[PDB]
Design a protein around this ligand. Sequence first.
Ligand code: K5C
Ligand code: MG
Lengths: 556, 412
Amino acid sequence: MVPISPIETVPVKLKPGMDGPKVKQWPLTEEKIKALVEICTEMEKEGKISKIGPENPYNTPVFAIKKKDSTKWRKLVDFRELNKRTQDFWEVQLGIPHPAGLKKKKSVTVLDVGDAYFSVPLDEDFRKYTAFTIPSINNETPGIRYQYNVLPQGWKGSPAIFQSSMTKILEPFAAQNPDIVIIQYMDDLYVGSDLEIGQHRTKIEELRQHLLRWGLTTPDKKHQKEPPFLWMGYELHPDKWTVQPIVLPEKDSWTVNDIQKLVGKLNWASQIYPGIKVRQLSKLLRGTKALTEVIPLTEEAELELAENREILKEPVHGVYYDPSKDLIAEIQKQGQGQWTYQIYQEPFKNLKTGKYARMRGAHTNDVKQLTEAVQKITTESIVIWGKTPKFKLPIQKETWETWWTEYWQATWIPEWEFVNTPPLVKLWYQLEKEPIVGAETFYVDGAANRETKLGKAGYVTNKGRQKVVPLTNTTNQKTELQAIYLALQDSGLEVNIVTDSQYALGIIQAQPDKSESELVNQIIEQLIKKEKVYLAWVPAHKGIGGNEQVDKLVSA
Amino acid sequence: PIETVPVKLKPGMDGPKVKQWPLTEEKIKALVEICTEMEKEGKISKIGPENPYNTPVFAIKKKDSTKWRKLVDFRELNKRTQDFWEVQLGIPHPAGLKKKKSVTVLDVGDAYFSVPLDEDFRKYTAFTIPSINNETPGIRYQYNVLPQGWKGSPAIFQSSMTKILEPFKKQNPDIVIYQYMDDLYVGSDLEIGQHRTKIEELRQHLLRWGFLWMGYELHPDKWTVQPIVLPEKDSWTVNDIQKLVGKLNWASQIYPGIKVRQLSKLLRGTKALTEVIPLTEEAELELAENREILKEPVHGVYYDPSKDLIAEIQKQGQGQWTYQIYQEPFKNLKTGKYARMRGAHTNDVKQLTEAVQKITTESIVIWGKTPKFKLPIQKETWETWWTEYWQATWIPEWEFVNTPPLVKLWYQ
Ligand SMILES: Cc1cc(/C=C/C#N)cc(C)c1Oc1nc(NC2CCN(Cc3ccc(S(N)(=O)=O)cc3)CC2)nc2ccsc12
Ligand SMILES: [Mg+2]
């Protein structure tokens, strides 16, 4: 007998105050009981479970299940109640590697560690909570009662404790073999390296020698998968990676969940297929929870889905990461708040792709959206590669300089250069900092009656130009914007405008180029037509001329 | 110091479960080396999957330094840790620190590593060194000793600190020494010349009692509420008068007796914005009376140590930033203005991050606590970048301003 080290046991507790499960065993057929007795008998001789006396007051129901052609019975212990009462664990399997961050590996071996799983002992003081009972034939004897000595499959802590125990086991081997990489994927262990096949195979044999120290035997996975590996929805080829095939289904009738798995396939495909768009398909969902509701595709969603078929016509592949070369991210404006990007090191061979959609808001502009896209790509790139990429953006250096030096908020984009790929992001208007000499001065105001929704909007100017327009079904805020719109409409290319509307200032000072309010959009279109606009604010009802005169005109 | 002080969380509160944010490769490598040697020195230990808690960690470089420093963001654990009435029901904040001519700040956080942490509480200090691209599981640690940046560390260590100082303290009984978290604020009313020696003899005083060579020095003779000033002009345009009346209308929320009636009547009619308006002497008198009102302090402004301090910041352009500290609107306890933020003439966010740290430092000196910031920046931009320019060992709270305040013009 060769002495083997024990696997260090993880201490486990129930949630504070809670006790172990006490669930009654359901009645079974005689044939199922006979099946469960044989299964547990062999499990017992393998050390997985152990018979217990009648003092244990806990119980978890056990079942017997079959399969179609598999003509045997399966054991199943339903630990749902115990899982509700078990402490939380550090789930160390949260995020997976992204293939675009992986580096080429000449050779990769697959090891089966499924039987090493049962060498992981369960905390002695917790075993009592895993008790279960095989009912007896005809209920004429006491049921056979067992408890687990190993990590039960289906128990809350089993995946985290298993992977943590293997990682601790493998830690010295990985650290003293820096020229190999090891990761664990369910019952599979994958070992890659750039060594010639001779030295690689040696490292594998050394790994088996290392795992024997804990009594773990690791044969290579049966029925060797020849490349590519089907892993986490990807195809990992020796020099390329891509998602598994994306197949858009043909349909003349789509309901809201046919589109929601369409959105998921496209969202999945968008990490390598460039230019994928999903807004017009996603907008077709918002306010419904009944998934069988057939919704007609808009003409804009058929167009969008058609364009996605054209990008999905041919498989495309991403390259793996070369740390010796630069990391570059390039962004394009797509329209309707949508943006796409490619991350690459050499031209025309993308590591990955992606998309960004503008946040929900009343008003927005392209520069703010481009900035948000940059921050998202920055954060994703630090996750995948540990560094910020160099950016190529469709915005002139002079445009960005004007924006951030005048914007009321602090803002920042990391190292980037202009790429001349239309449509270019630009500033569509810029208000003046000082009043314009020789330009007509419009004093604007609007008012609406809260109960009747009747209102007025208008202006008076230093040249005696005047206007008041009556309005129905309106609010104070809308009439204040209307008044500004009228002044812009009726003035020459340069104009000074005086308002008391804090609401209108707050909108315009946010520098929107698009809005969900058609009135704001109309104001934006007027601002684009002007050469110079100075917008000045004054407090209301303080006797300021021009403003006091127009306030009288519009306040009934 | 073998006896650990028992520590608990607030009633009905679990430990922190804060996600670790992504780190660059060079910050990960720095944290690996730092934590490897901390583990060798017994300050931290590896932990298992039965610990589900987490507090974020990153790496910084302190002022004028190139050695990486580990910074733990204990903000969540701090608000979940029991209130600490140390050995007293409290230390009254030294109201004289903000009056000294010179205050040097000394990083004494390394002293915390001499005191072991309550073994039942260690699990709540769990943190994770992440790996790039999730290619290995994060390195999980917990603290065995008082960690830098934790609320309990200065409280539990203070009795040990009171005695380390008091030989120095009775030598120089007019030197005010104040402790906030990992930092010691040593203020002397003597000119810089022998202040540095007095800090250096404290610096060697401590090392004889079991450092970091480093100290940033402040001069709080400055710290007041900046006055509201009005323009002094010989010719006023309609636009000038309009801006003045708007500023005075805003000031009238703060000061009693501000009047704009006579100044408004100068704007009787519908005049071009650029037209010059001669001031009547009624308007001049009214303007003069407002000037006088704005010379006096604001009525009934008092610090209430039970309420939060609020700090607002405005970007004024050209590297200039204005800020106000208050607890109640229009009752400013302190206002200020900054210019020429070092090492960032082309980085708004770096400038804002440095402004936040300097305002927080001022707030520590004056009140002994950090303010809650209202930051003029989008959340996603701030969150992506502020750790890149952070140089302090504490971290305040902040919220984001998404609508442009009209009042930026009035602090202009
Ligand atoms: C090593 C490994 C394997 C898999 C597969 C699971 C399945 N099912 C998944 C991950 C995340 C792995 O983990 C790492 N993988 C890499 N790189 C990869 C390795 C695989 N190749 C593909 C390939 C290579 C060689 C052959 S071959 N010629 O041997 O047949 C066939 C296919 C692409 C890059 N890098 C790292 C770094 C730290 S972990 C880790
Ligand atoms: Mg009005």
